[PDB]
Amino acid sequence: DPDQLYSTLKSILQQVKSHQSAWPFMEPVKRTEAPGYYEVIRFPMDLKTMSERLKNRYYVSKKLFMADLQRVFTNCKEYNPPESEYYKCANILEKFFFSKIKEAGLID
């Protein structure tokens, strides 16, 4: 009853991380891999960083969690071409994410 949010968030983040379309998002994009990524994307985010944030008790509300995870998708979509494998992954996983958020009644 106290630590309810933490539990729900952890379950959701784990399901997202195990999803077969999560692989592009598991770790920070490297500048060496992506020319001018960090010029274009000002608030980078990824699921390893979110795991850390969660463990660090940063996600004190649904909204903070939802914003970080939404940003993972919107970074990817802005940066990559629309028919790229990363873009396809991003919308697949975003669909999955919204279905789990609704499924847990996460209200913000």
Ligand SMILES: CNC(=O)c1ccccc1OC1CCOCC1
């Ligand atoms: C979400 N990822 C990207 O927008 C990305 C863009 C350009 C180059 C690499 C990228 O991320 C890699 C991070 C490590 O796994 C493979 C994708």
